[PDB]
Amino acid sequence: AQVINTNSLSLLTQNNLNKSQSALGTAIERLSSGLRINSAKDDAAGQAIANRFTANIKGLTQASRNANDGISIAQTTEGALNEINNNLQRVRELAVQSANSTNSQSDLDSIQAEITQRLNEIDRVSGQTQFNGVKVLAQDNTLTIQVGANDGETIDIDLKQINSQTLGLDTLNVQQKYKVSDTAAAALTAAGVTGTASVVKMSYTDNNGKTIDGGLAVKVGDDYYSATQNKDGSISINTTKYTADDGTSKTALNKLGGADGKTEVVSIGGKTYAASKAEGHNFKAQPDLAEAAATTTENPLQKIDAALAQVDTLRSDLAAVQNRFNSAITNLGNTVNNLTSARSRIEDSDYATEVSNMSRAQILQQAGTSVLAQANQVPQNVLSLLR
């Protein structure tokens, strides 16, 4: 029919343009983003699966970094145990040297001076070694390293307190007792000592009969307290200062005793400490302190071998978890890549495909546009019947 009021063919061709416009838009979006899935309307199940892959990829990625922090704990702990082991090997060698009876008592004192410095160095390294504030040799502690993406997916590191006390060497002593004697030359009542007192000059005799001058002491019975004469001419008992369990600073008198019979020792609580260890110590913050040795150690070489054994055991446990963390990191790496490929196969756009889809849709848009112009010309024909 010769109709003008309506142009169905124009309507039809306008409609068709929508189809190719949508297609073109889809293609351009995918090219733009690099993603096949741009909204849940593309592939709702795919988006949720890809998103859950993303959480694991990110999680496992993080987990890997956590396992490297686990390696760092174990390496730095093992490094400190290495030098504790070197110190114990020197102490053992010194104990083998000390056992020979051709040593004089001053040779034994000289050997004990290095043994004390070596045991103090083990205690120092134990107290001071840390990794991100974890005091790795100072306390028994189980760290949990997060190696997985989910709750509870952990590997334990078991840290142990290693020091001269837990090694059983805190009182390790190779000295022999001097014969103690006195000749006649001060008050003690502020410490509660009640016996009658006098100043004496100490002397010490060795196994061969050689005599050594000890200096001044105050004698009250079987006790001798170490003493010094000042410029004033007055004679005062030596003392140490410590922070007690009360948290206040407090004082102790320096008695003469220990394994050699001439070491300055102090009674704090009910326990006997070397004055050089007790001075400035904090018995509130650190109530555990090595007591003074009272006598020569029995079987020192057996005890030092057991200390070497303990360090060996802990080094072997730390080597075992380092091998486990390297295996876990290896696995993690592989896993990450595999899940990254799996996610990619779901959400990533195929450029070859999309480029092709874009150019096909552009041609259809151009064809449809030129055909709509022709459909709009069809009714012009009718005007020639009127004019």
Model description:
With 387 residues, the chain is of the alpha+beta class. Among the domains are: 54-171 and 299-334, f41 fragment of flagellin, N-terminal domain (Up-down Bundle), CATH 1.20.1330; 179-278, f41 fragment of flagellin, middle domain (Beta Complex). It is built from 7 helices and 12 strands. It has a 5-stranded antiparallel β-sheet, with no helix packed on it. Strands 10-11-12 form a 3-stranded antiparallel β-sheet. Belongs to the bacterial flagellin family. This is Flagellin. Flagellin is the subunit protein which polymerizes to form the filaments of bacterial flagella.
Total number of strands: 12
Number of helices: 7
- Order of strands, main sheet, comes to 3-4-5-6-7
Regarding quaternary structure, what we see is monomer
What is the second-level CATH architecture of the domain at 54-171 and 299-334? Answer: Up-down Bundle
Classified in CATH, the superfamily of the domain at 54-171 and 299-334 is f41 fragment of flagellin, N-terminal domain
Order of helices and strands: HHHEEEEEEEEEEEEHHHH
Q: Compute the gyration radius: what is it?
A: 44 Å
The CATH topology of the domain at 54-171 and 299-334 comes to: f41 fragment of flagellin, N-terminal domain
Helix coverage percent of residues?
Answer: 40-55%
What separation lies between the terminal Cα atoms?
Answer: 19 Å
Q: Which CATH top level class of the domain at 54-171 and 299-334 fits?
A: Mainly Alpha
General shape: rod-shaped
Largest sheet: 5 strands, antiparallel
Keywords: Bacterial flagellum, Secreted
Family: Belongs to the bacterial flagellin family.
Function: Flagellin is the subunit protein which polymerizes to form the filaments of bacterial flagella.
Pfam family, one: FLIC_barrel
